[PDB]
Design a protein around this ligand. Structure first.
Ligand SMILES: CCCCCCCC
Ligand SMILES: CCCCC
Length: 205
């Protein structure tokens, strides 16, 4: 996780597209080791969105040099169908997935737990879901999340699995905290960009 740290934000707070995509492309493969095929569709959404942004980038790397470039170029390119199109739509959903992971990991690191059930991660996942995704899901997908939550491993197994090497839980969590610095900062900047460009949509799925 901290082997693929995101770069820091530059002074102008512009996020270069290519390095950003390389960095977040290391996140999906962790889903293969949470111990359930319930996570396969989740990996596909995140990866699928990464792939969609990459494919738009590849058609003109200079024009789409930054994430900001993408939104303003596509706004101009598409007119009325924007922002519900292209890389802008893919990144709208990617950000919510990345924020989910962010909120989840930070909750874990901050020592949040169910006193009654200390070695589960359900309360952590549930907070992340409420903060990042829930308001954009209709009742059917929300019910599916509630089912999928039971596929979550134990906290100990989860942390040990990320340490995939010979390291204490405390050490592992300090590495996660390190990863979270630039990760959170970058996602914040993407969320701010959506707000300023008025590119955020609230439709539910
Ligand atoms: C550099 C971006 C590569 C696209 C990978 C898509 C799956 C995470
Ligand atoms: C990349 C780890 C994801 C946990 C939700």
């Amino acid at each position: 996780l901290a082997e693929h740290l995101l770069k820091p934000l530059p002074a102008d707070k512009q996020i270069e597209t290519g390095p950003f995509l390389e960095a977040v492309s290391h996140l999906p493969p962790f889903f293969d080791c949470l111990g359930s095929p319930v996570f396969t569709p989740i990996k596909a959404d995140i990866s699928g969105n990464i792939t969609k942004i990459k494919a738009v980038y590849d058609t003109n790397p200079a024009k789409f040099r930054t994430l900001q470039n993408i939104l303003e170029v596509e706004k101009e390119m598409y007119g009325a169908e924007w922002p519900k199109v292209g890389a802008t739509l893919a990144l709208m959903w990617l950000k919510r997935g990345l924020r989910f992971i962010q909120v989840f990991l930070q909750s874990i690191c901050d020592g949040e737990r169910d006193e009654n059930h200390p070695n589960l991660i359900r309360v952590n996942a549930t907070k992340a879901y409420e903060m990042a995704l829930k308001k954009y899901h209709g009742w059917i997908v929300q019910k599916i999340f509630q089912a999928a939550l039971y596929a979550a491993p134990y906290k100990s197994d989860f942390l040990k699995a990320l340490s995939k090497q010979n390291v204490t839980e405390e050490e592992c969590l300090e590495k996660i905290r390190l990863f979270l610095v630039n990760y959170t900062a970058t996602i914040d900047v993407i969320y701010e960009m959506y707000t300023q460009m008025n590119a955020e949509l609230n439709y539910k799925v």
